[PDB]
């Protein structure tokens, strides 16, 4: 059997690191065979945890570090994904407690760098992947996880993300939070993104959203003053298109799920009324 | 050359114009010379330009390993908008106007959701600027928005293009006006000059008044027994002055003519000398 | 002409072509390890080294002239300017002309003024922070600079890589203490220790009273949390303490101090494995 097996069963951290960093020319192959080999190894949770890196949870890094992705960081991200998607419940409490402190220290770091809200694509998806694989620190707030998911560009990460089971347990909880906060559309996004549609009244959430904005839009109806009229029109349309995109992103046809709002039609109506409203601004 | 393009625009072929423009990124210059020309010949050029930028603009640049630097998908979009401003083509259908209007409202909303317009890529800022510049400015756009867009877009290299809008020309005056009152003066003049509005603005009054205020606040804290307070008020003053000299020089205005009176390079040497003085005298240790 | 008996670096420095030195450095950027041994040398072989590096930084550095499309991925110009500032701190050139000092001083001033108009110094490119810190470290800290500004530059700067060159300052070595005494009074402990270690000033500060006041206020908070109602509030207070420790640990291992030797009598090495074992306990029992 080919070298990757040799690596895994022989438990060589930096060997595997170098190996992947080496095969980066075609990542496809790595997706196919890496998580395979990882199963054929002796206690893979700790292989992957040692295999991770220091500068990753360490107090700040590199130089051109933020918003780039050098092959060190990359190899470690990718290992995390591959380990998620190799499907192993294997880790014993040593590995767990460690990966836990890891994520905690990491979060502290990000919180100092200005909060989790401002964080790198690389950092966010990094801690997401981390915690996702080894479990979520008690300390982590919900809003934190929200921000991680938000920043990580989680969609091209979905398959491997929804394999999580630490994530799968905690995420619904965090979406409920978002739902209670007027963050409707985004909650529908998170839900759809993890394969959690089943656990949220989605049709309800979107419908409520649209309704509230319909009422806001009616609220300012005769303001005279054409500009307030146009402003509230733009706002409403934006909300519509907002739901429109969230849905078609996930391959949901709003002409069906929200059929009965006749969104396409209300959009043409609002835009026509807007051009009308513009002819009534300049001279004639 | 004018034929690939006179076909492309005559024949209203969107994906074609874009692929062309992406192809000829090698020489961008002659691209800038031929395209706005070609664009006058399109049947409904507004429409063609909207079709030309499409969605990947307003939603894009989310590619993972970061460095918001510029791929030639976005590049071509910027290019098409500039050329479309240069074509002096106008009076688009109200259909395209409102579509592009919504596009802008949405793009802005995104920018806000991402931490504000104040922090936005040069590419996002310039893109949204060029969008509104061409197809009009949505109601929801706040003056301070326009101000940051212009600020972040490096408008100097876009200037003559920006200068053709009439959307930015009806609105930009209100913006420089508001910027004088809230005290932005040096930048209000930078904008003024950038759009070729120096006529409609008392530039001398504004720069001058700015320097006045700094000269006085330079005197509040002036003569008393405080090498530190001295050097400090000195640096504030120096810097406001260099702010004026760089701003005028950027527009190839001689500050030693237009702001002569006020001899600046002079006051700057006097002040940097005074400073070195205090730097030798502050020793005491 | 046996004038070719000198080096190209040497010629470039002696002849004082800012532009030429920049182009040269930009071009040899492939190998920076060589430039680090060669340039600080050739630098003292110039008529006026400070005016030359100031000429070399260029308008484009401080002014906030950044290539439109490009990311800070280094239009190599910026890489070069940071490298020149660095190599000139490394060249042990003192005695600069006061014209150049107050010019550079003004540059550092307008740089800051700009950083502030951009959302504050606190948010800064790693590039900007390193650049300004190097600037000030070579030509002196201006009046207007507050200690806070300085802290953020030092922190945001990734100093540990730049520390050898950073340690030659004396504009820095003179101010750093005032800044650290500031940070200690601010409850900044592990990080103020981190600064004092990076600037060579470990000896001039109560490292022990610091790392201690910290680890003890953090045991005192965590004893208050050994009761009161939850296995979750327990794992919380517990990861809290465990982090604070692991941070003192990583801080000293960074600077090649032994966590034990400096703090031993704590046995934070034992305490770590004790609280890890203890949340593996609270992990099975939840």
Helix intervals (H) in chain B: 2-10, 14-23, 28-38, 45-59, 74-86, 94-113, 122-135, 143-152, 159-162, 168-181, 185-194, 203-220, 227-250, 255-258, 264-281
Number of domains observed in the structure of chain C: 1
Give me the residue from B157, B232, B275 closest to C102, CB to CB: B275
- Rounded (10°) CA dihedral B259, B260, B262, B267: 100
Structure determination technique employed: X-ray
Chain B residues whose beta carbon lies within 8 Å of the beta carbon of residue C110: 239, 242-243
Between CA A51 and CA A41 the distance in angstroms is 13
H/E element, A240: helix A226-249
Phi-psi bin for B262: left (phi > 0), alpha (psi -120 to 50), beta? left
Q: For A196, which DSSP code?
A: -
Query: Do the Cβ atoms of B189 and B201 come closer than 8 Å?
Result: yes
Q: Which of B64, B68, B94 sits opposite A153 (nearest CB)?
A: B64
Contacts of B83 (CB under 8 A, 6+ apart): B32, B35, B36, B39, B161
Using alpha carbons, select from B107, B176, B175, B96 the residue that is nearest to residue B136. B96
B240: which residues sit within 8 A by CB, 6+ positions away? B186, B210, B211, B214
Closest residue in A to B98 (Cα–Cα): A271
* Pick from A227, A271, A265, A226: nearest CA to B106: A271
Structure tokens at B235: 């640096």
Distance (Å) from the alpha carbon of C276 to chain A's nearest alpha carbon: 6
User: Cα angle at C129 between C127 and C130, to 5 degrees?
Assistant: 65
Q: Are C136 and C101 in contact (CB under 8 A)?
A: no
Q: Which domain, by its residues, includes C25?
A: 1-286
Q: Let me know if A37 is exposed, middle or buried by CB neighbors in 10 A (0-12, 13-18, 19+).
A: buried
C74/A64 CB distance under 8 A: yes
Q: From the list A121, A271, A274, which residue is nearest B64 (CB)?
A: A121
- Note the residue count of chain B: 285
Tokens 């930048």 sit on residue:
B187
Other beta carbons within 10 Å of B95: 16
What sign has the CA pseudo-torsion A221, A223, A227, A228?
negative
Residue in the structure block whose two tokens are 């009076």: B91
Nearest to A75 by CA among A94, A56, A100, A103: A56
Distances (CA, A) of C200 to A99, C129, C140, C164, C167: 33, 20, 19, 10, 7
Q: Which of B122, B238, B246 sits opposite C68 (nearest CB)?
A: B122
Question: Is residue C103 exposed (0-12), middle (13-18) or buried (19+ Cβ within 10 Å)?
Answer: middle
Contact C110 B242 (CB under 8 A): yes
The residues on C that touch B, with CB distances below 8 Å, are 63, 66, 68-71, 73, 98-99, 101-103, 105-106, 109-110, 113, 119, 142-144
Q: B49 near B18, Cβ under 8 Å?
A: no
């Amino acid at each position: 059997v080919s070298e990757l097996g040799f690596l895994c069963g022989m438990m060589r951290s930096r060997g595997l690191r170098k190996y992947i960093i080496s095969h980066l020319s075609d990542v496809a192959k790595l997706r196919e065979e890496v998580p395979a080999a990882l199963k054929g190894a002796p206690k893979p949770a700790k292989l992957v945890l040692e295999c991770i890196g220091r500068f990753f949870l360490q107090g700040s890094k590199a130089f051109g570090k933020a918003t780039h992705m050098v092959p060190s960081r990359q190899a470690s991200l990718l290992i995390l994904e591959f380990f998620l998607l190799s499907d192993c419940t294997e880790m014993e409490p040593s590995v767990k407690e460690e990966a836990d402190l890891a994520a905690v220290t990491w979060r502290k770091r990000l919180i100092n760098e200005g909060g989790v809200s401002n964080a790198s694509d690389i950092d966010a998806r990094g801690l997401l992947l981390l915690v996702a694989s080894f479990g979520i620190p008690a300390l982590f707030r919900n809003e934190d996880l929200r921000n991680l998911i938000r920043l990580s560009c989680p969609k091209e990460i979905s398959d491997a993300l929804r394999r999580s089971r630490f994530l799968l347990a905690r995420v619904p909880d965090v979406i409920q939070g978002m739902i209670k906060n007027q963050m409707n559309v985004e909650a529908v996004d998170f839900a759809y993104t993890f394969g959690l549609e089943e656990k949220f009244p989605i049709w309800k959430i979107l419908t409520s959203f649209l309704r509230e904005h319909k009422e806001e839009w009616k609220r300012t109806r005769e303001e005279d003053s054409p500009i307030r009229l146009k402003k509230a029109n733009e706002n409403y349309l934006s909300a519509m298109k907002s739901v429109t995109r969230c849905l078609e992103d996930h391959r949901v046809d709003p002409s069906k799920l929200l059929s009965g709002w006749h969104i396409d039609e209300k959009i043409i109506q609002l835009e026509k009324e807007m051009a009308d409203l513009d002819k009534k601004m300049e001279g004639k």
